[PDB]
Every structure is written in C-alpha cells, then in structure tokens.
Amino acid sequence: QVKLEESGGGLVQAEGSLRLSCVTSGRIEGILLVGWYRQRDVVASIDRNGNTRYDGSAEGRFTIARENANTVYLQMNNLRPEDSNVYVCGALSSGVNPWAWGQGTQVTVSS
Incomplete structure (x- = not known):
C-alpha cells in the first residue's frame, strides 16, 4: 500500500554530481523513515522527525x-x-508489510 518511484540516476564523470529523487504514493501517513540504499546497505535516511542519518x-x-x-x-x-x-x-x-522498495536506479561514474 506504499509505492515508491525513483528518478535522477545515470552516467556522470568522476567528481560530478547527481540528485536522486524518490516519490512515495499511497498510505504515506504510516511511513517512519525514507532512505536510499546500495543494492541493502543504507547510504542516507530521513525519519518522520526530520532526523538525518x-x-x-x-x-x-x-x-x-x-x-x-x-x-x-x-x-x-x-x-x-x-x-x-x-x-x-x-x-x-508501521505494521505487517513494513518495507516498501523502489524499482532501483543505476548510477555509473566514469573515470
């Protein structure tokens, strides 16, 4: 009942930048935390109180x-x-189906 759609990846040269975007839809009221994970180890997250990790x-x-x-x-x-x-x-x-995942976004950094 939570759906995630990702954008913003692609190909960039070393020392360049990207901005990954994650959009939630559905029952967003129960979301405790949203994060980005290396395909799953956390890279960064933000919780309902705005705390960032x-x-x-x-x-x-x-x-x-x-x-x-x-x-x-x-x-x-x-x-x-x-x-x-x-x-x-x-x-x-919160609940029985605790985790929802986006479709995944490729990031390739060239030399």
Whole structure:
C-alpha cells in the first residue's frame, strides 16, 4: 500500500554530481523513515522527525532532504567510480508489510 518511484540516476564523470529523487504514493501517513540504499546497505535516511542519518562513505558529500510530503532527494556530490551501483529507495512503515522498495536506479561514474 506504499509505492515508491525513483528518478535522477545515470552516467556522470568522476567528481560530478547527481540528485536522486524518490516519490512515495499511497498510505504515506504510516511511513517512519525514507532512505536510499546500495543494492541493502543504507547510504542516507530521513525519519518522520526530520532526523538525518548518513553512512560514513556518504557523510560530507551527500545530502538527503525532504522536499515535500511525498518526495525525498539525495544530492550526491564528488562522486567516484567506486560509487557506481544500483541505488534503491526504501520506506519503513508501521505494521505487517513494513518495507516498501523502489524499482532501483543505476548510477555509473566514469573515470
């Protein structure tokens, strides 16, 4: 009953930037946390109180922010080839089906 749709990935050169966007639809009232995950290990997350959490590799280069009630983005600066990955948006809700996942977004960082 929560659906996630992702955009913003693609191909970029090293030291470039991307902004990944995750849009939620459905029963968003029960969402406790929205995050971006390396396809699943967390990169960054933002919870219902606005608290943000970053993995050590993201801290200082990436920023997660909530744009509105349905939209969370991850600004990725100073990308490196080792950052090439499929990134997936996840939402943690309260209840029996706790996790919802987006379709996944390819990020490729060229040398």
